[PDB]
Amino acid sequence: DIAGLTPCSESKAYAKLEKKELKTLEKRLKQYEADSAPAVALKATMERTKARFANYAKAGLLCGNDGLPHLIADPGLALKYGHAGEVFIPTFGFLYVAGYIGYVGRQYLIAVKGEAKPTDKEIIIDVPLATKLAWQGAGWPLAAVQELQRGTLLEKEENITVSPR
Amino acid sequence: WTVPTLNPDTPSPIFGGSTGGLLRKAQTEEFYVITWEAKKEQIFEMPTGGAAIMRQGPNLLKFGKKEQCLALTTQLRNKFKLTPCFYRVFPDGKVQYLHPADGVYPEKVNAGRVGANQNMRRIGQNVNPIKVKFSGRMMSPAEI
């Protein structure tokens, strides 16, 4: 398929890998009773193992000669062949959360700079203010862009201290 | 105020002795002598380690380097409120007096002192190292 890979659902090594893991679990099972606590736990593990291998094959991943899933990172190859969920979609999932956390913290830091004693508002958090800013961060991409266009996102070069040069 | 003259026969504190005293340097290059007056017999700490009792009246000690003499001077002055002075003594018998150089301790401003190594500029107004290059020796821009 892509880069010589093959779908895991059609991979011989991938299928053999599942048997090896289940065989290991089964070997430990036969030293217990039918419905003892250890036996129930082992059976639960085997169910998750079978579900995991079905899900990855159902997801249409690609397996190498090693018979293990490999991920596609190029946006063009991902959208071309329906691998957007491996890296491409999670890329924009993380950035939204990462910007959320960073934007909320920046809003709080600006908020307390106006207070009389900003330092005491950092070791001792103003929880009522933090919760207020936590909820308003859901729209950070909109607020972040509007700050950039209005020119209030960055400090002026003349207001930033620098070393002699 | 006139430069004091050292009296080699001045009595010394009651001290057993230690291994932290003078070495062969004192016999070849120089050593230092500190003298002071004691109001009453008291126990003080030797910079070389241990405790010594200062006799009432004049006292004299010999040390291996200048910093040891001025370390004892700080103790005597700050804690026991005395006024010591020490010299530099050479093996040839010459004696050089210092601290106080002019009789007044340097912390207190005194008329007659001449400023030394004073630059009438800020640190940020020194020239660049390139401009003092090939001056015959490694020279900092601060020197010129």
């Binding site: - | 070495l23 062969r24 340097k25 290059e29 291996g64 380097k65 200048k66 910093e67 040891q68 001025l70 370390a71 210092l98 601290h99 150089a101 340097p106 912390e107 207190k108 401003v109 005194n110 008329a111 002192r113 001449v114 400023g115 030394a116 190594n117 004073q118 630059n119 009438m120 500029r121 800020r122 640190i123 940020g124 900092s140 601060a142 020197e143």
Partner: protein, 80 residues
């Protein structure tokens, strides 16, 4: 011998002179500051380079600077 320089930003606090553990520095009269006194370095041959004077200077940047230079028995702080 090390090099010790006093710059014209001195405010005559005397802290460098008190800090020095070898009596290298002293205060002299001056007219360039409110205290009317300035630090001086007349005995740099006894300087060891500890830089306790720089630790004690309040001015920013420092008004007393020590440039470590040629070594000797006195500047190397040897008692042997």
């Amino acid at each position: 011998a090390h090099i010790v320089k006093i710059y014209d930003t001195c405010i005559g606090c005397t802290q460098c002179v008190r800090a020095c553990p070898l009596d290298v520095l002293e205060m002299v009269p001056w007219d360039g500051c409110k205290a009317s006194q300035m630090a001086s370095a007349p005995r740099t041959e006894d300087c060891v380079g500890c830089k306790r004077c720089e630790t004690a200077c309040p001015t920013d940047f420092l008004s007393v600077r020590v440039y470590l230079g040629s070594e000797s028995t006195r500047s190397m702080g040897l008692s042997y």
